[PDB]
Amino acid sequence: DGCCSKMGGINYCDSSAGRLVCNNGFYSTCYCTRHAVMDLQFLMGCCLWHGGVYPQLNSSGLVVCNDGYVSEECSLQK
Amino acid sequence: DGCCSKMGGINYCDSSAGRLVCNNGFYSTCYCTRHAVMDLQFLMGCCLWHGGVYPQLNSSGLVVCNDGYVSEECSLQK
Amino acid sequence: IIKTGDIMFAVLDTSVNSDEPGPILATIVTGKLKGSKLIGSFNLPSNADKMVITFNTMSIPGAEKTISISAYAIDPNTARTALASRTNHHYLMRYGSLFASSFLQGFGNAFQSANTTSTLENAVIGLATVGKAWSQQAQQLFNTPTTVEVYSGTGLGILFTQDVT
Amino acid sequence: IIKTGDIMFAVLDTSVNSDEPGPILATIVTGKLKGSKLIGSFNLPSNADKMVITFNTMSIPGAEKTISISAYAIDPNTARTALASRTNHHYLMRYGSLFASSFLQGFGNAFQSANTTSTLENAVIGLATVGKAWSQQAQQLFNTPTTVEVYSGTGLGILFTQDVT
Amino acid sequence: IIKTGDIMFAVLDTSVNSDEPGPILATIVTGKLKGSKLIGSFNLPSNADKMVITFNTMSIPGAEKTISISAYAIDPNTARTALASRTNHHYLMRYGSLFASSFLQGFGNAFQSANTTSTLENAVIGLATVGKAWSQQAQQLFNTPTTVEVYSGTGLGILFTQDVT
Amino acid sequence: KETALSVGAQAGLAWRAKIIDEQLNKQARNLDAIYDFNSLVLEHNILPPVLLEGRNTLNLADAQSIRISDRTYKVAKQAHFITTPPTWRQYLWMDYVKPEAPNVTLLPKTKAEKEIWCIYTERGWKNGIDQANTILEENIARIKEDFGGMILYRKLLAMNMVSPPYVSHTDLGVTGDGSEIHIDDRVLRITALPELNVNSAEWRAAVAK
Amino acid sequence: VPKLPCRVDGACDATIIKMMTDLNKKGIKVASVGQNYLISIPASALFADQSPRLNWASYSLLNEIAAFLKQFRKIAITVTSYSSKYVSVKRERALTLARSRVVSEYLWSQGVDSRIIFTQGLGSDKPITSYTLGGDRSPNARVEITFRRAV
């Protein structure tokens, strides 16, 4: 987590750029804000590319997305 | 035991043919998936070549098939 | 149609002490009924020469009904109505407690009595006073019976009492 | 639709001393009902060789309904009705208090009686008079039973009595 | 909507003694209801082996209503219903007063008895007469039970009994 | 026991889901190369409809009653409009939720109890593996169905047995009151849906070399 | 699991490799390419000179080749018979045809679960060596059985 290692250290965060500036004029591999252009390829969650988790609760453990589609991927079984 | 015995060993299973592949490039003599080529002629069960087992729990010991045929040898005797 | 008074079998899987009654179920393992369960309860006899489970509520799968053919229990492979259990649970505890309280009281009073004809005096002291209170408390507690207890892996036989349909 | 007299599991998560009965809840951990909670209570027996939880207040999620199926308890993987706890909580304390009060009474009376055939006299004095009131108070408070206590980390098995829809 | 038989936490910041019933209130800080507070009182058991709070007058802010879901108390982070309190408040005082009165009476009567077989006689006098009145008044006031007391900075766990909205 | 079965099912299902998702991720660009979509989109940014083809149809009504035909063609989904074309992510992705609430329920004390616990988790793990395989297969089948339907629409459109979707557009100049203005309100509808005709003459054949 | 067979019965690949090594040690040519397999036998270890008749002791080796062929899963097999030039064309063609016919008949008598068998003999039309100075000991005079493995 030591980002500006072997340098002068952290100067501040260019929050427009989303990266901490080292004390020499370069950008760290780390980021400060969540508004940062990073690579995102894999993520968690159920009912993806659908309506999401419906706010209702069921007698069974069946989970149906809000778009009308039913998901068996995270649903339980016998 | 070892299916790829006296060979290179178990490399991976081809599911398109349902067979394991030894490290020497030969099809093994063991299957891996269910959906392969079996050769079995003995089968269990009763009400066969018929409507199958009628699902109702009858009080009497005579069990009938769904197509109407009566299988007393599957049933108990008096 | 079940004829009035033939013999069926069940296997009992749950044990219970003879202190608090409750629902006890057996698994009917043979006959025309398969998957059948039989709940009933028990009673406490005054003498331990037999012990039974009184069965009343029959549940049969397949059809949603609850018939009420009620029957009693006989011992497996004996065809007798006694229960295979132990009854010597609380003979010796109350017997020895009462007798020790008595012997204590007697020790203190008679070795006080034989004084005419300090540590031995203190022996007289301890026995003469811890005999009596323990004696009355032991005769207070002497009436508790020895419980019986069925076991959790024994079958039983059941003889029918009425008809059903 | 539940068959009459079948066995389900539940897990008891909080413990309570058996002096104030109250609503105790478990979570039903197997079967068709999942996420369901259930409150009931106990009763204190005269002999503590078993202890059960009556269980009637059943809440099932999904819809806001409260069914009232009543059932009893058995010990899972044991299939017996006893409680896995201690039963010798308050025997030896009251035993020792009574016997000490006795020994005081006996010391005073007998070693005053042995006076015929300073500090020893005052020993007679002290035990002679502090045996009596303490002895009757010990018989006064001697009647408290030994409490049992169900535990917060052992489940229980619930066997059905009636049907629900 | 609160389901039948779930667990909630309550924040308690005031202590009460177990002699005068009155209003006590807890602060529900977690769960669905925030800003809520709950009034009730305590109970006095014959044996002080646990101490609990019956809590019924439940109040939720936002809308001015005062609902009546009633429930009981668990000691927090304990999974036990005991109260972390004291129960030995008034044992040693009454024991010492009674036993001192007894030793006094015994000293006067027995050292008057040992006269046959001035100042020391007056010691016999004082013990002989002040033992008895203090003994009977010690048996008069010996009956006061040991009070128990909750603390003014300990929360509690509340397990539900019925539903509200 | 059954709790071990359930958690073995959940663990095997989630683990297979994680592995198949990272495999699908690391085999990335050839998926879009295969299932290219915006190349298939027609000229007015309108998704082509879905078609199905069947050959050598036989139905038995009852005794002494059969009906036979050579080929049948079915419209599956009507053509409609779209702004951004679909991709393979909304067909071949499976969810990931880590099931991580184990408490000892059927209590493992004896060595044989732990052994049967292990084998029950093993067979539940196998069942979750099979479940993930079946789910992947069904998703592959439905995306193949939709892609083949689009391919078949291009086929029959190049065969001339289907109406191309007829369009109409209306242009309006500056609109609105003295407080609101739009520049050029062009609203365009489609009148004729893609529909197949029954005319025998309008078939035109083809011949390879 | 007691219903589902774990493997195909009568198939141990260690025994397969062992008998392949034994057969090549005996000198019968074993060829494995892709899935198609080729088994070449010299003629002089199977017949007498210019003879349409089996020698007596050859049944042991034919039993060994039946023990080989019972292991695999197969559909269609083919046998060809090649010879050297002795008298004519037609006599040699018919002799090769008869040799293939006899070995095919005993191979069918053995209960190998084939489905199709083909037989043909061509005499001395397709040689595999330029050196032809041997008689029936010449290695082009041979019998050949080829097949493609099922699955």
Residues in chain F with CB shorter than 8 Å from the CB of D30 are 2-3, 105
Alpha-carbon span F125 to F129, nearest angstrom = 6
In chain C, which among 13-32 make CB contacts under 8 A with chain B?
A: 32
User: How many angstroms from the chain centroid is the CA of residue C25?
Assistant: 18
Alpha-carbon span C67 to C163, nearest angstrom = 10
β-strands A70-71, A63-64 pairing: antiparallel
Place of tokens 């197509």: B67
Alpha-carbon span D7 to D30, nearest angstrom = 10
Alpha-carbon span E146 to D137, nearest angstrom = 16
Q: Does D2 touch chain C (CB under 8 A)?
A: no
Alpha-carbon span D76 to D9, nearest angstrom = 8
Contact E159, E72 (CB under 8 A): yes
Is the CA virtual torsion D160, D161, D163, E4 positive or negative?
negative
Phi, psi angles (nearest 5°) of residue G93: -65, -45
Contact F79, D129 (CB under 8 A): no
At D22 the three-state DSSP class reads coil
Chain breaks in chain D (C to N over 2.5 A) after: 117
DSSP letter assigned to residue G19? H
Contact E2, D33 (CB under 8 A): no
Alpha-carbon span C11 to C27, nearest angstrom = 5
DSSP A22-68: ESSS-B-SS-SSS----------BSSTTTT-B-S---SSS-EEBTTS
Q: Which helix (H) or strand (E) holds D38?
A: strand D37-42
Residues in chain D with CB shorter than 8 Å from the CB of A60 are 34, 62
With an 8 Å Cβ cutoff, are F96 and A44 in contact?
yes
Residues in chain D with CB shorter than 8 Å from the CB of F109 are 77
According to DSSP, the residues that pair with G145 across neighbouring strands are G39, G79
At E85 the three-state DSSP class reads coil
Produce one character per residue of C137-155: b if its CB has 16 or more CB atoms within 10 Å, e if not.
bbeeeeeeeebbbbebeee
DSSP letter assigned to residue G18? H
Place of tokens 């045929």: B69
Q: Which of F100, F119, F94 is nearest to F108 (CA)?
A: F119
Alpha-carbon span B29 to B10, nearest angstrom = 12
According to DSSP, the residues that pair with D126 across neighbouring strands are none
DSSP letter assigned to residue A7? S
Q: Does C132 touch chain D (CB under 8 A)?
A: yes
Q: Which of D50, D55, D115, D53 is nearest to D85 (CA)?
A: D50
For residue C150, what are its two tokens?
């069925």
Residues in chain E: 165
| HSE-up of residue F151 (Cα within 13 Å, Cβ side) | 10
DSSP letter assigned to residue E165? -
Contact D159, C23 (CB under 8 A): yes
DSSP letter assigned to residue D149? E
Q: At what angle do helices E92-113 and D92-113 cross, to 10 degrees?
A: 10
Strand order in the sheet with C72-74: C53-59, C36-42, C24-28, C7-12, C155-159, C72-74
According to DSSP, the residues that pair with G118 across neighbouring strands are G78
With an 8 Å Cβ cutoff, are F95 and A76 in contact?
no
Q: How near does any CA of chain G get to the CA of B59, in Å? A: 30
Contact B29, B45 (CB under 8 A): no
**Left (φ > 0), alpha (ψ -120 to 50) or beta: where does F45 sit?**
left
Of D13, D116, D125, the CB nearest to E117: D116
User: How many angstroms from the chain centroid is the CA of residue G73?
Assistant: 17
Q: Spell out the residues 6+ positions from residue G142 whose beta carbon is closer than 8 angstroms to its own.
A: G40, G41, G42, G43, G81, G82, G128
Q: Spell out the residues 6+ positions from residue F76 whose beta carbon is closer than 8 angstroms to its own.
A: F49, F50, F51, F52, F149
Q: Does F6 touch chain D (CB under 8 A)?
A: no
Chains interfacing with F (3 or more CB pairs < 8 Å): A, D
Alpha-carbon span G147 to G4, nearest angstrom = 29
Q: Spell out the residues 6+ positions from residue F136 whose beta carbon is closer than 8 angstroms to its own.
A: F20, F92, F94
For residue E20, what are its two tokens?
């005068």
- Report H helices in F39-164: 89-92, 111-157
Cα dihedral F83, F86, F87, F89 in deg (nearest 10): 110
Q: Does F58 touch chain D (CB under 8 A)?
A: no
Alpha-carbon span C56 to D162, nearest angstrom = 13
Q: Which of F36, F186, F15 is nearest to F97 (CA)?
A: F15
Mutate to test the interface with E, among D125, D142, D144 (most CBs of E within 10 A): D125
User: How many angstroms from the chain centroid is the CA of residue G114?
Assistant: 14
According to DSSP, the residues that pair with C8 across neighbouring strands are C158
For residue G63, what are its two tokens?
């039993």
CB pairs under 8 A between A and D: 12
**Count of CB atoms within 10 A of residue C29's CB?**
14
User: How many angstroms from the chain centroid is the CA of residue C164?
Assistant: 32
Residues F101, F103, F107, CA angle at the centre, nearest 5°? 150
Residues in chain A with CB shorter than 8 Å from the CB of F90 are 49
β-strands C72-74, C155-159 pairing: antiparallel
Contact E152, E16 (CB under 8 A): no
Contact C156, C24 (CB under 8 A): no
Mutate to test the interface with D, among A54, A56, A57, A59 (most CBs of D within 10 A): A59
Residues in chain B: 78
Q: Does B60 touch chain C (CB under 8 A)?
A: yes
Q: Which of E83, E89, E91 is nearest to E43 (CA)?
A: E83
Q: Can you give the resolution of this entry in Å?
A: 4.6
At C73 the three-state DSSP class reads strand
Alpha-carbon span G35 to G72, nearest angstrom = 11
User: How many angstroms from the chain centroid is the CA of residue F1?
Assistant: 38
In chain D, which among 2-41 make CB contacts under 8 A with chain F?
A: 9, 11, 29-30
Residues E117, E122, E125, CA angle at the centre, nearest 5°? 80
Q: Spell out the residues 6+ positions from residue A53 whose beta carbon is closer than 8 angstroms to its own.
A: A46, A47, A63, A65, A66
Produce one character per residue of E44-71: b if its CB has 16 or more CB atoms within 10 Å, e if not.
eeeebbbbbbebebbbbeeeeeebebbb
Q: At what angle do helices F2-26 and F111-157 cross, to 10 degrees?
A: 40
**Left (φ > 0), alpha (ψ -120 to 50) or beta: where does A15 sit?**
alpha
Contact D43, D59 (CB under 8 A): no
Nearest Cα residue in chain B from G8: B29
Produce one character per residue of A18-43: b if its CB has 16 or more CB atoms within 10 Å, e if not.
bbbbbeeeeebeebbeeeeeeeeeee
Q: Which of E82, E40, E69 is nearest to E162 (CA)?
A: E69
Q: Amino acid letter at B16? A: S
Q: Provide the strand spans (E) within E34-109.
A: 36-42, 53-60, 65-67, 72-74
Q: Does D147 touch chain E (CB under 8 A)?
A: yes
For residue D25, what are its two tokens?
């809840």
Nearest Cα residue in chain D from C63: D3
Give helix then strand counts, H and E, for chain G.
Answer: 3, 5
User: How many angstroms from the chain centroid is the CA of residue G87?
Assistant: 25
For residue D18, what are its two tokens?
């058996």
**Count of CB atoms within 10 A of residue F106's CB?**
18
For residue E38, what are its two tokens?
């709950």
Query: What is each CA distance from F9 to D9, F4, F12, G4, in whole angstroms?
Result: 20, 8, 5, 22
DSSP E93-159: HHHHHHHHHHHHHHHHHHHHHTT---HHHHHHHHHHHHHHHHHHHHHHHTTPPPP-B--TT--EEEE
Q: How near does any CA of chain B get to the CA of C34, in Å? A: 9
Give helix then strand counts, H and E, for chain D.
Answer: 2, 9
Q: Burial of C86 by CB count in 10 Å (0-12 exposed, 13-18 middle, 19+ buried)?
A: exposed
DSSP letter assigned to residue F96? B
Rg of the Cα atoms in chain G: 17
Q: How near does any CA of chain F get to the CA of D51, in Å? A: 21
Q: Which of E103, E87, E107, E85 is nearest to E95 (CA)?
A: E103
With an 8 Å Cβ cutoff, are E82 and D17 in contact?
yes
Alpha-carbon span C88 to C94, nearest angstrom = 12
Alpha-carbon span C127 to C111, nearest angstrom = 9
Nearest Cα residue in chain G from B4: G13
Q: At what angle do helices C119-141 and D119-140 cross, to 10 degrees?
A: 10
Q: Amino acid letter at B26? A: F
**Count of CB atoms within 10 A of residue C158's CB?**
23
Is the CA virtual torsion E121, E127, E128, E129 positive or negative?
positive
Chains interfacing with C (3 or more CB pairs < 8 Å): B, D
Cα dihedral D47, D52, D57, D61 in deg (nearest 10): 160
For residue F127, what are its two tokens?
């069942």
Query: What is each CA distance from C91 to C95, C101, C120, F111, in whole angstroms?
Result: 6, 16, 33, 39
Q: How near does any CA of chain D get to the CA of F6, in Å? A: 10
Alpha-carbon span D8 to D5, nearest angstrom = 10
Q: At what angle do helices C92-113 and D92-113 cross, to 10 degrees?
A: 10
Cα dihedral E53, E56, E61, E62 in deg (nearest 10): 150
Residues in chain D with CB shorter than 8 Å from the CB of E142 are 137
With an 8 Å Cβ cutoff, are A58 and D34 in contact?
no
Contact E55, E10 (CB under 8 A): yes
For residue F102, what are its two tokens?
């184990």
With an 8 Å Cβ cutoff, are D131 and C132 in contact?
no
Contact C11, D79 (CB under 8 A): no
Q: Spell out the residues 6+ positions from residue C15 whose beta carbon is closer than 8 angstroms to its own.
A: C149, C150, C151, C152, D79, D80, D81
Alpha-carbon span D139 to D147, nearest angstrom = 19
Residues D146, D147, D151, CA angle at the centre, nearest 5°? 140
At F160 the three-state DSSP class reads coil
Contact D90, D147 (CB under 8 A): yes
With an 8 Å Cβ cutoff, are E7 and D16 in contact?
no
Q: Amino acid letter at D109? A: N
Residues in chain G: 151
**Count of CB atoms within 10 A of residue G98's CB?**
16
Q: How near does any CA of chain G get to the CA of B75, in Å? A: 23
Q: Which of E47, E52, E53 is nearest to E87 (CA)?
A: E47
**Count of CB atoms within 10 A of residue F158's CB?**
11
Alpha-carbon span G144 to G127, nearest angstrom = 13
Contact F30, A51 (CB under 8 A): no
According to DSSP, the residues that pair with C24 across neighbouring strands are C40
Residues in chain D with CB shorter than 8 Å from the CB of A59 are 60-63
Alpha-carbon span D7 to D161, nearest angstrom = 10
At B38 the three-state DSSP class reads coil
Contact E82, E50 (CB under 8 A): yes
Q: Burial of F174 by CB count in 10 Å (0-12 exposed, 13-18 middle, 19+ buried)?
A: exposed
User: How many angstroms from the chain centroid is the CA of residue D165?
Assistant: 35
Q: How near does any CA of chain B get to the CA of C18, in Å? A: 36
Of G4, G5, G13, the CB nearest to B6: G13
Contact E69, E164 (CB under 8 A): yes
Alpha-carbon span G79 to C151, nearest angstrom = 74
Q: Spell out the residues 6+ positions from residue F128 whose beta carbon is closer than 8 angstroms to its own.
A: F8, F9, F10, F11, F12, F13, F14, F15, F16
Contact C131, C112 (CB under 8 A): no
Place of tokens 């393992």: C29
Q: Spell out the residues 6+ positions from residue G59 whose beta carbon is closer than 8 angstroms to its own.
A: none
